[PDB]
Design a protein around this ligand. Sequence first.
Ligand SMILES: CS(=O)(=O)NCC1CCNCC1
Length: 165
Amino acid sequence: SFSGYLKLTDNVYIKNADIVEEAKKVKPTVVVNAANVYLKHGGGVAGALNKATNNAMQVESDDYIATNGPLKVGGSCVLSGHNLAKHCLHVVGPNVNKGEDIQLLKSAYENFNQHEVLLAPLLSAGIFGADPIHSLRVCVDTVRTNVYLAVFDKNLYDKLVSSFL
Ligand SMILES: CS(=O)(=O)NCC1CCNCC1
């Protein structure tokens, strides 16, 4: 199972790790992708997860969008986890760099509650532009299922742990 995580709460755990490497190692039931409404996995966590699938995630995602249309900001869909996990839960957190409402971050994290255990990044963090300290607080106050957070940046991981209330 998951190794080397620091326990933050009864159900939230955190580790300084590359989520692709973490997924390839653990092969969790669910890996969360920091998706956008179009499932265009260009950069950030989405670009990295997609590249690890040799673009199979993008091919599957384009078929999903052609059939269903775009996701809502705060919404999600379950697709294959390919070589990373049994499933990938593509969750759309608000992108404050595209002027999206930060209030949607709680709705985005609520998607995690449909899965008993997940390997995930901090939603809306990184290139999505939100404060990762705020994202972690919304995560621990919203998610009730077991979430293993992978934070790529060591300096950000240290800041998150040292400022965790
Ligand atoms: C760690 S998890 O609860 O996400 N998955 C359970 C098993 C162990 C890891 N490989 C898949 C089977």
